[PDB]
Amino acid sequence: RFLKVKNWETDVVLTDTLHLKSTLETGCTEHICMGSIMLPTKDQLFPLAKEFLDQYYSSIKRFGSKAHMDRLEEVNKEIESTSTYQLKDTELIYGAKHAWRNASRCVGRIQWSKLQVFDARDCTTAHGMFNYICNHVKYATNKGNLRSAITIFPQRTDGKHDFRVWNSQLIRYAGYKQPDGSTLGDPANVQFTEICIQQGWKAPRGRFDVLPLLLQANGNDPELFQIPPELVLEVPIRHPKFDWFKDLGLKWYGLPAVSNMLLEIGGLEFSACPFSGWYMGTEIGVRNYCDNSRYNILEEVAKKMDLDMRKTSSLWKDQALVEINIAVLYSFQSDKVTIVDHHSATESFIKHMENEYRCRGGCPADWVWIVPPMSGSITPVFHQEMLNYRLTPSFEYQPDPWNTHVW
Amino acid sequence: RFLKVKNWETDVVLTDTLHLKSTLETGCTEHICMGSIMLPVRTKDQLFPLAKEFLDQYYSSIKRFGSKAHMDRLEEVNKEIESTSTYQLKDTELIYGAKHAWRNASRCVGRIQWSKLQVFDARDCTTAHGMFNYICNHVKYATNKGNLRSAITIFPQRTDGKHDFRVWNSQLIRYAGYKQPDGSTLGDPANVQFTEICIQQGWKAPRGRFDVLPLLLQANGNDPELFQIPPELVLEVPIRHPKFDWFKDLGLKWYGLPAVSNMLLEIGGLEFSACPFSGWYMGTEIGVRNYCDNSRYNILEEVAKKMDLDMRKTSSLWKDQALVEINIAVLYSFQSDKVTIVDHHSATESFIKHMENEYRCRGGCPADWVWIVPPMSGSITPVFHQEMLNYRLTPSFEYQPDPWNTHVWK
Ligand code: HEM
Ligand code: HEM
Ligand SMILES: N=C(NCCC[C@H](N)C(=O)N[C@@H](CCN)C(N)=O)N[N+](=O)[O-]
Ligand SMILES: N=C(NCCC[C@H](N)C(=O)N[C@@H](CCN)C(N)=O)N[N+](=O)[O-]
Ligand SMILES: C[C@H](O)[C@H](O)[C@H]1CNc2nc(N)[nH]c(=O)c2N1
Ligand SMILES: C[C@H](O)[C@H](O)[C@H]1CNc2nc(N)[nH]c(=O)c2N1
Ligand SMILES: OC[C@@H](O)[C@@H](O)[C@H](O)[C@H](O)CO
Ligand SMILES: OC[C@@H](O)[C@@H](O)[C@H](O)[C@H](O)CO
Ligand SMILES: [Zn+2]
Numbered sequence: 001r002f003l004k005v006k007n008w009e010t011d012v013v014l015t016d017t018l019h020l021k022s023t024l025e026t027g028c029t030e031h032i033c034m035g036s037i038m039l040p041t042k043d044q045l046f047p048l049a050k051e052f053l054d055q056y057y058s059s060i061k062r063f064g065s066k067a068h069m070d071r072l073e074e075v076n077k078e079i080e081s082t083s084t085y086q087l088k089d090t091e092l093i094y095g096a097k098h099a100w101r102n103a104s105r106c107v108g109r110i111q112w113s114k115l116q117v118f119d120a121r122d123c124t125t126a127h128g129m130f131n132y133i134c135n136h137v138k139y140a141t142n143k144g145n146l147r148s149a150i151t152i153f154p155q156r157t158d159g160k161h162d163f164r165v166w167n168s169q170l171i172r173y174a175g176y177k178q179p180d181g182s183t184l185g186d187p188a189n190v191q192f193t194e195i196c197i198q199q200g201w202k203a204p205r206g207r208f209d210v211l212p213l214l215l216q217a218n219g220n221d222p223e224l225f226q227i228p229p230e231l232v233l234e235v236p237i238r239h240p241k242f243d244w245f246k247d248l249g250l251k252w253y254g255l256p257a258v259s260n261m262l263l264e265i266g267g268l269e270f271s272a273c274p275f276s277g278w279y280m281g282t283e284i285g286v287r288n289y290c291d292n293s294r295y296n297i298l299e300e301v302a303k304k305m306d307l308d309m310r311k312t313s314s315l316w317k318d319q320a321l322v323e324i325n326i327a328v329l330y331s332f333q334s335d336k337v338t339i340v341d342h343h344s345a346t347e348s349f350i351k352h353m354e355n356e357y358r359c360r361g362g363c364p365a366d367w368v369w370i371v372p373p374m375s376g377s378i379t380p381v382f383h384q385e386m387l388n389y390r391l392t393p394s395f396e397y398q399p400d401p402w403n404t405h406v407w
Numbered sequence: 408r409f410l411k412v413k414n415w416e417t418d419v420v421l422t423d424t425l426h427l428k429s430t431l432e433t434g435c436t437e438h439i440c441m442g443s444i445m446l447p448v449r450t451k452d453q454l455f456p457l458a459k460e461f462l463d464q465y466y467s468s469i470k471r472f473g474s475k476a477h478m479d480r481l482e483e484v485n486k487e488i489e490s491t492s493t494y495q496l497k498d499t500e501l502i503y504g505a506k507h508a509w510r511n512a513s514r515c516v517g518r519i520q521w522s523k524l525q526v527f528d529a530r531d532c533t534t535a536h537g538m539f540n541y542i543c544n545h546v547k548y549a550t551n552k553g554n555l556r557s558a559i560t561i562f563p564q565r566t567d568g569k570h571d572f573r574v575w576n577s578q579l580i581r582y583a584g585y586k587q588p589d590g591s592t593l594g595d596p597a598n599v600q601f602t603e604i605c606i607q608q609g610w611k612a613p614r615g616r617f618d619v620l621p622l623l624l625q626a627n628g629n630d631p632e633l634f635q636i637p638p639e640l641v642l643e644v645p646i647r648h649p650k651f652d653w654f655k656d657l658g659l660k661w662y663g664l665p666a667v668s669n670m671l672l673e674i675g676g677l678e679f680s681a682c683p684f685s686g687w688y689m690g691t692e693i694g695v696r697n698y699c700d701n702s703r704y705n706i707l708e709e710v711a712k713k714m715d716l717d718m719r720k721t722s723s724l725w726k727d728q729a730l731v732e733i734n735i736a737v738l739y740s741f742q743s744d745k746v747t748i749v750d751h752h753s754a755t756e757s758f759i760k761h762m763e764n765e766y767r768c769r770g771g772c773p774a775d776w777v778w779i780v781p782p783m784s785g786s787i788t789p790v791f792h793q794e795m796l797n798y799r800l801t802p803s804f805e806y807q808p809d810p811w812n813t814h815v816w817k
Pocket of ligand 3: 168169256257258259260261275276277278279280283
């Protein structure tokens with residue numbers, strides 16, 4: 001019941017006791033592992049609230065205290081009467097930070113305690129949501145010196161007045177399927193891009209068009225808004241040696257801001273909780289640019305580098321891949337925009353894991369997601385065994401709203 | 408129950424029904440995933456059912472399920488187990504068994520080749536000298552002057568656990584590792600302990616950077632004995648680069664035949680503790696892991712310097728640049744010397760085709776994503792984007808503790 005994890009490069013062994021607090025299912029069983037699978041009532045609520053509040057008061061060293069007991073009863077009576085309850089600001093902050101701390105797929109959790117939390121629970125309309133969002137983007141961007149932040153909108157009530165940010169991230173590029181049959185822009189956003197058009201947006205039909213926010217407040221139909229262009233920091237991509245690189249016409253936005261996840265704290269569900277930190281280089285250079293279903297620029301770059309693309313064994317794709325990633329990092333650093341390379345980030349994650357095992361008894365981690373998409377084994381996490389389990393507070397996936405909204 | 412796996416690059420979705428025949432446990436629970444953990448005598452009682460399951464599978468494979476031949480074999484084996492507490496496989500069953508252990512190996516990306524395995528039956532072997540001869544023959548056949556052929560040599564199964572046949576080497580061919588008084592290592596760090604055992608057993612170590620280790624062979628539970636593999640039988644490739652003439656002066660080379668010799672082959676409940684097998688290398692095994700792991704030859708620095716890369720900051724990605732060149736060098740050298748090798752792009756592409764074929768004709772293909780995805784350029788290979796299901800099917804290859812930790816010395 002006390003599992004051990006070993007690093008096969010340093011031989012360091014850590015013992016995990018934290019996993020014994022996990023409640024939710026992993027998708028795996030004694031017969032089958034689903035580790036590589038992407039997506040594996042008043043009576044229900046109070047126990048969840050109790051679990052959360054107990055961990056909260058324990059964190060502030062007041063477990064068992066009258067305050068602890070008083071709060072517990074207050075919430076209890078609130079659920080019995082209102083069928084729900086409201087978190088204190090302190091509980092909200094502690095909850096959001098811990099949902100990040102518990103995110104097993106995030107390699108940047110060494111930064112978890114520094115999260116800026118924006119309480120938007122007083123929001124009532126989409127226009128109010130737009131305002132809170134612009135403020136988050138401006139705050140988080142900080143002229144290039146990115147600061148992690150989350151903005152939390154009202155919690156779910158009966159499920160028919162949910163607040164939702166239809167976008168997958170606050171800032172993304174549109175995608176349109178052209179006559180040729182090809183795709184212009186980001187193929188990943190082809191569908192969302194049309195839903196925007198399907199009701200208003202006027203697309204420049206470019207390769208890198210910033211999508212408009214489609215905000216849904218109180219269950220009402222979503223409304224479009226253009227993020228003040230001046231608030232969207234973008235970085236033109238060039239290479240520190242290949243002067244022809246800039247000719248590729250490539251750029252990427254500086255703020256990664258997941259906006260479609262669900263934040264669960266003490267049983268409460270916050271369906272609109274956009275958060276942002278900063279990029280790990282490979283996210284852009286390896287995945288966004290080189291995935292065959294994304295901008296898929298490997299061939300173009302290989303051709304400009306004049307590499308023998310006749311055979312796979314010449315490793316031309318690999319050589320081009322490295323160059324594209326050196327460019328991305330070079331470009332962001334040159335424009336003084338925060339970004340971290342996979343070596344540095346993974347090194348920090350190992351440090352974080354050790355801290356967590358020492359001070360918390362463990363660190364849920366998903367190896368499949370933690371190991372960078374390029375040069376896996378030359379990063380320390382590849383050699384690190386990890387135990388994946390679910391702890392709450394948590395960030396969860398949720399269905400795209402267009403597949404559930406009743407207009 | 409049907410289980411769906413999706414490929415996030417092509418949106419192709421496959422349905423798995425094969426997992427229903429999984430018996431062994433994975434190490435995971437409905438509460439914790441141990442997907443990245445490296446390692447998470449039978450009774451007459453527990454043996455016939457294991458035998459029955461296997462023979463049922465075997466007979467169904469040859470389209471003779473339920474036949475008189477099928478029923479007689481089951482009766483023959485049952486009587487044999489009741490009578491001797493164990494049983495012997497027919498040559499055909501052993502061949503079928505070995506091929507399927509490979510076919511079921513979740514961590515192997517080269518399984519598109521499974522049906523082509525050459526099985527050498529060494530169950531009549533009784534001594535360590537006998538084992539050496541069988542192993543020499545395996546290496547010569549498999550090497551085939553560079554046109555590698557996959558093969559497996561199978562020694563006598565376990566009986567009471569006190570007469571085990573074991574190849575103490577982790578692979579038939581590996582380089583010695585020597586821990587120096589100053590704390591540094593000469594040779595391959597991965598083999599320091601085994602090298603010390605060899606020396607203690609009498610091996611005269613040339614103490615170089617690439618000394619092929621001698622075989623330490625255990626027959627019938629007796630103490631192991633040392634044998635030197637005929638040098639003329641050990642094919643090696645000097646490593647050089649197509650554009651960098653200084654690469655060759657790094658003094659690197661690697662053996663051409665990868666031959667895992669420490670796993671246990673389980674077939675129909677029987678345990679074959681000595682079953683060396685070989686195929687051929689995927690370049691990253693050598694170029695990424697053996698050469699670039701910090702705990703192995705660790706050559707990234709020396710290579711990076713010679714390329715005059717900016718090593719002042721990791722963000723120059725000098726490690727990644729050097730890495731690619733080293734792997735280019737490994738592939739180029741093997742191809743130049745006409746020694747079979749496969750690059751990670753070709754191997755992963757073939758594995759995806761193999762996997763889809765298996766779903767269609769078999770109902771599944773257990774696969775360990777953590778092991779299948781190559782150690783470099785992960786997402787530019789199709790397997791990175793492929794959801795996999797990992798489960799254990801028998802026949803199978805299993806880990807077993809190193810023999811020096813369990814052997815009762817005589
Ligand atoms: C500040 C530095 C940060 C860095 C460098 C970072 C890096 C990463 C990376 C590289 C991924 C994988 C992304 C992908 O492949 O799609 C990721 C995933 C994730 N991160 Fe972090 N992160 C940071 C901040 C945050 C913050 C502020 C939160 C939450 C408040 C967070 C929550 C998550 C979650 C929940 C996932 C998994 C999302 C999914 O399943 O798609 N991260 N992070
Ligand atoms: C013919 C070409 C072959 C190729 C290219 C291939 C490639 C690989 C590679 C790249 C690995 C991972 C090795 C590591 O990282 O340590 C592997 C693992 C494995 N392969 Fe294959 N393989 C081949 C043949 C074979 C054969 C002949 C068998 C058995 C009859 C086999 C059984 C296995 C097993 C059981 C493992 C997992 C070993 C472990 O867990 O440590 N492979 N293979
Ligand atoms: N570095 C970050 N990267 C997040 C990148 C999100 C990723 N590009 C993405 O598309 N995620 C999908 C989920 C795909 N599993 C989504 N949020 O809809 N996050 N951050 O706050 O610092
Ligand atoms: N390509 C192959 N590669 C196998 C390479 C074996 C690997 N280098 C190794 O050291 N395996 C450990 C097992 C580590 N899990 C052992 N055999 O003791 N196999 N083949 O048959 O062609
Ligand atoms: C199928 C497989 O789960 C999928 O391709 C995963 C693998 N690891 C990943 N890791 C990260 N960080 N991000 C991803 O999108 C993925 N995709
Ligand atoms: C800790 C982690 O499981 C370990 O480093 C694994 C990862 N994937 C691997 N994949 C292959 N092919 N070979 C290995 O030795 C490993 N090591
Ligand atoms: O075009 C819409 C897509 O961006 C959307 O469906 C995402 O795939 C989804 O939000 C999960 O990332
Ligand atoms: O030097 C001994 C090692 O080669 C040996 O203990 C291996 O680690 C073991 O066979 C697993 O690979
Ligand atoms: Zn699992």
